[PDB]
Symmetry: C5
C-alpha cells in the first residue's frame, strides 16, 4: 500500500534466500534449464507492530493484500515466474516473514571448450528497484539457502549452491537498483562417452590403417573409403547434439585431425600404387614399411599435444 | 477463512485418496508422464456442526469460499496442478467431504540398466505445510485408492497402484510438514523388440562371419566392412530412444562387444592374406579353420556371461 | 444455484447431442486427435415456468448465471474443454435450451494389426455426476447429432458419427454417474502407400535375386550386401511412423521375412562358391538352377499365407 | 444492452471488412496458418440518435458495455480469437462504427497435386447466428478490405485478398446463419527447387546410364547399385523438405518412374552378361547399342507425357 | 479515462525509449527472435498539475488505473506483449514518467545471399493511433535507448542498437498513425564453419580427384561414386539448418558446381576406359595428363569468379 517511511536516513534492507526443490531439463542447444524452489524475504516495518499482552497472540497472519511487499524480479528469465504465496507472519516488534514457491526457466551461457569433460556454473540474479520515497538494498540470509536431498539432473553431478553476499548497486533508468548472484556448480558425467563414442572411432581408424599390410589396390581403396564414410556418419551422430560454438573446441580439433589422417592415408595408397606400376617395387616397399610405424606414432604425439594444450 | 481451533494439542488429521483415470505420455528422455485423477480429502471442523432435525436436511453444501480448506500441494510436478472442485458436503457432526479432479505432469527418475526387460516404479508425492496456529498431519484412506480398468499405456503393463501408509514428518523452513508416497508399478512389453532389433542384428553378424569360408581377399573386405556399416546404422537407430545413463547398461555392453568382434574379424582377414602372400599357405588354412569354430562359441559364452551379470 | 426439486423420486433427465464441425491433427504416435464441435443440452426446471400471455414473449433469454446448469464433463481429454456458451432459451412450460461450442484433445487407443489397410473407431465419453439431492441421467437426442460436410482428416475417410442410446450407470466415489459413448468410424486411404513403399521394395528384392544368373563371386556379394543396405533404410523410414506395438503386426512380419530371405540368399551364394572351388561344378549348377525357381515361389506362398492369416 | 427493435420485420444488415497486418507460420503438415488483422463492423441503432446542436459534440464514444454489439465468430479456427476493442464511435445518425484488432490460427485444406509449381487459396469464414427476436445478415464493405504491404510469407508470393459479396444463408441447429468468404491467393516460389533437387537427380541418373559403354560386369554392377543407393540417400532429403501429407503427386510419380528405370537397367546388365557368357557376343553388342539410345528417349517421352497429364 | 485537452491545436507528443535486457533464440527457419526489454514514455497532462509547496512533496505516484495511458502497440509481434508496470510518477508541471518491462516474440525477414559471411538488421516497430478528439505523435528520447552489457546471441556479434528520429505519419482506417523504427545490427561468427564444413569437403574432393593417377577402371569407379555419396551426406548435413531461398545464394551455387564437377569426372573416367579398350593408349594418356592439371585450375578460377560475383 505504501513503503515504510525512513526513520532518519536508513535504506530498507531485505534479507533473501532460495531453497532449491528441483532442477531439470538442462538444454545444451538453447542453454536453458528449469528450476523449482522456495523464496524467502524479511524486512522491517514499524507500522505493523502490536502489543502481545493485549492481543493475546504471538505472530499475526496477513494476506498478500493490505500489506506492502517489495517487488523482486529475476533478470535472466524467459518469462515472469509462476508464484503463489505460502505464508506471511508478523512479529511483535515489526519483522515480517514471507515465503513463496515459484517455477521459472533460466537463461545461462555455457562453455564447450572441454565438452566431454567440462564443468559449468549456472547463475540466477535477483534485483529490486528503489521506490521514490525509499532506497532498497538486498542481503543474503545464509540460514535459508540450500538444496533438496533428491535434486538431480540427467547426466550431471551437483556440487554446491552458494550466493555472493555482496550486492552490486548501480544506477539504471533514473533509479538505484541492487542485485544478487546465486551460483550453481555442476560437473558432467563422462563415463558413458568412452565406450559409446571414443573406442569405436579408434577401432574404425585401426581398420582403416590395416591397409598398409596389403598390395592390392582395390582392397585398399575399399577399406579406406568405406571407413571414411563410417567416420562421416559418426561425426554427424556426435555433432548433432551441441550448439554452434564461437571459438575452437576439443572435439572439433579431434575430428579435423581424423579427416587429415584419412586424406594422408589416401595419398600414401595412391603413391604406393603409382610407384609399383612404374616397376620400382623397392621404393614402394620402403614407403609402406615406413608408413606402418609413422602413422600411429604421429597420431599419438598429436593427441598428447592437443590434450596438453586444451587441459593445461 | 481460519484453521479450526484445537482442543488442547491434538494435531489436525486429513485423510487423502487418489483414484487414477488416465495415465499416458511416458517420455524416456524427459523422464516424465502425464496423469489425470480424482483427489479426495476429509477432516473434522466443529464450527460447521448442526442439528439435522432443526434444519431438516442431512447434508449441507458449501461453495469453496467461506470454508477453510487445507493446502495440499504435489512435490514433483513441473507446474502447479489445474484443478476444479466437484463436490463439498458437510456431515452433521462436522466431518467434511471434498473431491476435485486434476491433471499434472510428474517428474520421476528411471533406471535403464536392464533396458529391454526392465521394470519401473513411478512416484507421486503429497505434502502439506503446518500453519502457525495448528499442526496438520496426513493419512491414507485405503478405500478411496484405485484406478480405472480402461487405463492404457503404450508399451507398458500396469501392475499395482498402492500408497505407503506411514507418512514422513520433518521440519522444513522452521515449519513442520508431512509427506505421503503413491507408487505406480509398471513393467515393459518386450516381445516386439525381438524381431525388430535382436534377430536382424544376429543375421547381419552371421552374414559377416560367412567370410571364413572364402579365400578371395576383396570379397572378404567387402563383406566385413559393409556389415560394419549396417551395424552402425542399426546402433544409431537403437540409440535414438535410450537417454544418457551414468552407469553400464546391457545394450551398451552388447553393442561394444559387437564392435570388438568386428575389429577382431578384420584382423583375422588381414592375417590370412598376409600369410598367404608370404608363401605359407598352410598356417593360413589352420587359422581359418580355427576361427570358423572359435568365433561363434566365444560369442555365445560372452553373451551368457553378460546375461548372468546383468540379470543375476 | 440449486437443482430442481423432484416430484417424488423421478431422476432428472438431460438430453444431449454433439454436432461435429472440424476434426484434425490425428497423431498415430500419441494416439490422439483434436475436435471442434457443438454441444446441445435440454432439461426441465419448473421453477422457471411463466405464462406467455401476461409476459408478452414466447421465449426468455437467460445469462449463464442466475440459473442452474448441470456439470457435464468428458472423460478422455488431456484438459477440460475450452467452451463458451452461445444461447439459452426457456419455453413457457419450463423446458430450457442450451448450446455451446468447445474444442479439446481426445485420447483414443489405436490398433495397428493391419496398419496399411486398417479401420479405426474413435470414442468420446460424456459423464455427469449426481448431486446430493437429485439423481441425473443422460439421454440421446437423435435430431441434434451429426457431422459437418466439410470435416477433413488428412489421409482418412470419415464414415459415420453415432451414439449409443443406452447410458451405463455405475457408482463411483459413493455417487451415481451416467456415461454415454459417441463413436466416430474412419477408414485409412491406402492407395498412396503402394507406389511409395510397396513396389520399390519388390524392385530392390528382385535386383537382389538377379544374382542367381552369374558365377562371379565378387559381383554376387556386392549385389546382395548392397541391396541389404538399401533395405535397411526403407525399414527405418517405415518404422519411424507407427508407435510400438505389443502384438505381432503385418508390416513387422513382412519385414522380418525379407530379412530372412536376404540371409538365405547369402548362404546360397556362399555354398555355390565353396562347391565351385572344390572342382565340383555340377552340384553348384544344380543348386543355382533349383534356387532360381525356389526363391520366388516360396516368397509368393509365404505372402499368400500371411495375407490369409492377418485378414481372415 | 438488447438487440435493436425490429423495423418492419426486416433483417439487420452489417458491413464487414478485414485489413491484414501479419501472416505467418503456414504449416502445411497441419494445414494451418496464423493471422493478425483488424475487423470493422457497422449497423444501425435508432436508440443511439442524439442531437448534435444541443450536445455540442460531433460524435459520441461508448465503452463496449452498455451497448449491444453482434456476436461474430470465425468458423475455421482452433480457438476463439484474442480481440481487444480499439474504437467505438457513433455518427450523429444511427450508424455506429466499430473496430478491433485480433489474432487467430485458421484451418484451411491444402492441395499438393502440383507440389513444386502449385497455387493455393486460403479461406477465412465469418458467421453470425440469428437471435430469437431478430435476423442478422452480413455484407462486405469494399473500402475496408485491404492488406498491408509488409505482409510476407517464407517462400510464397501473395497475389490478392478479396471477399465474395454474396453470403450463404442456411438453417443450422434450428437457426439462420450467414457466411462470408475471404480468399487469399498465394503461389509458391519454385526456382530454388531446380538446382537443389531436379538437376542432381539427372546427374546421378546419367552417371548410372554410363554403364552402357563398358563390358566389365563387376564395374557395371558397382556403378548401377551404388547409384541406386545414392538415389535413396537423395530421396531422404527430398522427403525431409517435402510436406508430410500423403497423396498422389507429381514428385511421387517421378520418383517411382526413376525406380522403374533402375530396375530395367539392372535387368539389361544381367542379360548382357548372360549372353556374353554363352559365347554370343553379337546379341550382347546389339542389345547394348540399342539400349544406349532407347533409355534417354523413353525417359524424355515419359516426362513429357506426365507433364502434359498433370498440368493439362 | 480521457485524453488531455489541447490548448489550441497542438497534437500530443509521447517520448519513447527501449532498453534491451535480453535477446535470444534467433531462429533462421522461422525468422523470429525473442526480446526482453524496458519501455519508457513521457507526455504532458495539465489536469494532473499540483503545487509542491502546498503538497509538501515533490513527486506523486499513481496506479495504472485512474489515469489516462496512451495505447502503444508493436506491429511485427506474433502476439501481444506480456507487460507489467514498474513505476509511474507525476511532476508538478504535468510531465508523467512511465516505466514498464515486457517480453515479446518479433517477426523479421532475413537475407541469406551471403549466408556464411552475412550480416543482418532486425526491426522493431511501434505505433499509436489518434483518438477522436486528439492527435498523437511519437518521438525518440536518446537518453533512454541502450542495450545491456550481458546481451548475447549464440553465434552472433551485436554491433549497435539505434532508432530513426523521424516517424512516418500516415492515415489508416480514417485515423492518423505514427510509427517508429528501432534497428538492431548483428554479424555472424563465421570461423567455426571453416573446419566443420569447408575443409572436409575440399579433402573429399581431392580424394575424388586422385583417380587421375590410376589406370584401373574398377578402382576409379569406386573412388568417384563413394566420394559422391559422401558429398550427398555432407549436403544433407549442411542443409539441415537453412530455410528456403527465393533467389540464388552462395552456398547453393558452390554445391551445384561440385555436383557438376563430379559428373564431368565420371565422364572423363568413362572416356579414358573406352579409349583404352579400343587399343589407343596415346589418346588416353594425353587426356589423363590434361585433366590432371585442368580440373584444379578450373575449380580455382570458378571459385574466384563466384566469390567476386556474390561479394562484389
Ligand atoms: C578395450 C576393451 C575393454 C573396454 C572396457 C569398457 C570401457 C571401460 C571404461 C570405464 C571408465 C571408468 O572407469 O569410469 C569413468 C569414470 C567417471 O566416473 P563417473 O561415474 O562418471 O563419475 O572415470 C574415471 O574416473 C576412471 C578413468 C577411466 C580411464 C579410462 C580407462 C581405460 C579405457 C580404455 C581401455
Ligand atoms: C590443389 C592441389 C591438390 C590437387 C589434388 C591432389 C590429389 C592428390 C594427388 C596425389 C599425388 C600422387 C602422385 C604420385 O604418386 O606421384 C609419385 C611421384 C613420381 O615421381 P617419379 O618417381 O619421378 O615418377 O613421386 C612422388 O612420390 C612425389 C610426391 C607426391 C606425393 C606428395 C605430394 C602431395 C601433394 C598434395 C597437396 C594437397 C594440398
Ligand atoms: C594401434 C595400432 C593399430 C594397427 C592396426 C593394424 C593391426 C595389425 C593388422 C595385422 C597385421 C598382421 C601382420 C602379419 O600377418 O605378420 C605376420 C606375423 C609375423 O610372422 P612372421 O612373418 O614370421 O614374423 O604373424 C602374425 O600375423 C601372427 C599374429 C600377430 C598379429 C596379431 C595380433 C595383432 C593385434 C593388434 C591389436 C592392436 C590393438
Ligand atoms: C507383386 C504384384 C502386386 C503388388 C501390389 C500388392 C498389393 C495390392 C493390394 C490391393 C488391395 C488392397 C485392398 O483392397 O484393400 C482393402 C482391403 C481392406 O481389408 P478389410 O476389409 O479390413 O479386410 O484390404 C485387403 O483386403 C487386404 C489384402 C492384403 C493382401 C494384399 C496386400 C499385400 C501387400 C504386400 C505384398 C508384398 C509386399 C512386399 C514388399 C513390402
Ligand atoms: C550360430 C550359427 C551361425 C554361424 C555363422 C553361419 C555362417 C553361414 C554358414 C555357411 C555355410 C557354408 C557351407 C559351405 O561352404 O560348405 C558346404 C558343405 C560342404 O560340402 P562337402 O564338402 O560335401 O561337406 O556342404 C553343404 O552344402 C552343407 C550346407 C550347410 C549350410 C546350410 C545350413 C545353414 C545353417 C545356418 C545356421 C543358422 C540358421
Ligand atoms: C532439362 C530441363 C531441366 C529444367 C526443368 C525445369 C525448367 C522449367 C521450369 C518452368 C516451370 C514453369 O513454367 O512453372 C510454371 C507453370 C505453372 O502452370 P499452371 O499455372 O499450373 O498452368 O508450371 C508448369 O507449367 C510446369 C510444367 C511442367 C514442368 C516440368 C519441369 C521438369 C520436371 C522434372 C523433370 C526431370 C525430373 C528429374 C528427377 C526429379 C526428382 C524429384
Ligand atoms: C516373380 C518375379 C521376379 C522374378 C525374379 C527376377 C530376377 C531378375 C530376372 C533376370 C532375368 C535374366 C535372365 C537372362 O538374361 O536370360 C537370358 C535369356 C537366355 O536366352 P536363351 O539362350 O534362349 O535362354 O534370354 C533372354 O534374354 C530372356 C529375356 C527376358 C528377360 C527380361 C524379363 C525379365 C523378367 C521381368 C520380370 C518383371 C516382374
Ligand atoms: C584453401 C582455400 C581457403 C580455405 C579457407 C576458406 C575461408 C577463407 C576466407 C576466410 C575469411 C572470411 C572473411 O574475410 O569474411 C569476411 C568477409 C565479409 O565481407 P562483407 O562484409 O560482406 O564485404 O567475407 C569475405 O570477404 C568472403 C570472401 C570470399 C571467401 C571465400 C572462401 C572460400 C569458399 C569455399 C571454397 C571451397 C568450397 C568447398 C566446399 C564448401 C561447401 C560449403
Ligand atoms: C540425355 C543426355 C544424357 C545421356 C547419358 C550420358 C551418358 C554419358 C556419356 C559417356 C560418353 C562416353 C563415350 C566415349 O568415351 O566415347 C568416346 C568417343 C569415341 O570416338 P571414336 O574412337 O571415333 O569412336 O569419342 C569421344 O571422346 C566422344 C566425345 C565424348 C565427350 C563428350 C560427351 C559429353 C556428353 C554430355 C551429355 C550430357 C549433357
Ligand atoms: Cl520474475
Ligand atoms: Cl501443486
Ligand atoms: Cl471437460
Ligand atoms: Cl472466434
Ligand atoms: Cl503489443
Amino acid at each position: 500500500v505504501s513503503p515504510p517511511p525512513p526513520i532518519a536516513d536508513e535504506p530498507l534492507t531485505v534479507n533473501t534466500g532460495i531453497y532449491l526443490i528441483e532442477c531439470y531439463s538442462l538444454d545444451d542447444k538453447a542453454e536453458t534449464f528449469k528450476v523449482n524452489a522456495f523464496l524467502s524475504l524479511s524486512w522491517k516495518d514499524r507500522r505493523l507492530a502490536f502489543d502481545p499482552v493485549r492481543s493475546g497472540v504471538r505472530v499475526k497472519t496477513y494476506e498478500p493484500e493490505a500489506i506492502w511487499i517489495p517487488e523482486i524480479r529475476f533478470v535472466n528469465v524467459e518469462n515472469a515466474r509462476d508464484a503463489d504465496v505460502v505464508d506471511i507472519s508478523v512479529s511483535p516488534d515489526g519483522t515480517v516473514q514471507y515465503l513463496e514457491r515459484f517455477s521459472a526457466r533460466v537463461l545461462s551461457p555455457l562453455d564447450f571448450r572441454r565438452y566431454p569433460f567440462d564443468s559449468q556454473t549456472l547463475h540466477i540474479y535477483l534485483i529490486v528497484r528503489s521506490v521514490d520515497t525509499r532506497n532498497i538494498v538486498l542481503a543474503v540470509d545464509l540460514e535459508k539457502v540450500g538444496k533438496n536431498d533428491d535434486v538431480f539432473l540427467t547426466g550431471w553431478d551437483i556440487e554446491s549452491f552458494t550466493a555472493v553476499v555482496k550486492p552490486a548497486n548501480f544506477a539504471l533508468e533514473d533509479r538505484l537498483e541492487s542485485k544478487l548472484d546465486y551460483q550453481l556448480r555442476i560437473s558432467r558425467q563422462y563415463f558413458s562417452y568412452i565406450p559409446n563414442i571414443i573406442l569405436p572411432m579408434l577401432f574404425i581408424l585401426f581398420i582403416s590403417w590395416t591397409a598398409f599390410w596389403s598390395t592390392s589396390y582395390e582392397a585398399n581403396v575399399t577399406l579406406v573409403v568405406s571407413t571414411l564414410i563410417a567416420h562421416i556418419a559418426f561425426n554427424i551422430l556426435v555433432e548433432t547434439n551441441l550448439p554452434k560454438t564461437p571459438a575452437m573446441t576439443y572435439t572439433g580439433a579431434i575430428i579435423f585431425m581424423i579427416y587429415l589422417f584419412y586424406f594422408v592415408a589416401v595419398i600414401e595408397v595412391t603413391v604406393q600404387h603409382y610407384l609399383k606400376v612404374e616397376s620400382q617395387p623397392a621404393r614402394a616397399a620402403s614407403i609402406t614399411r615406413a608408413s606402418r610405424i609413422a602413422f600411429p606414432v604421429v597420431f599419438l604425439l598429436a593427441n598428447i599435444i592437443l590434450a596438453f594444450l586444451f587441459f593445461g
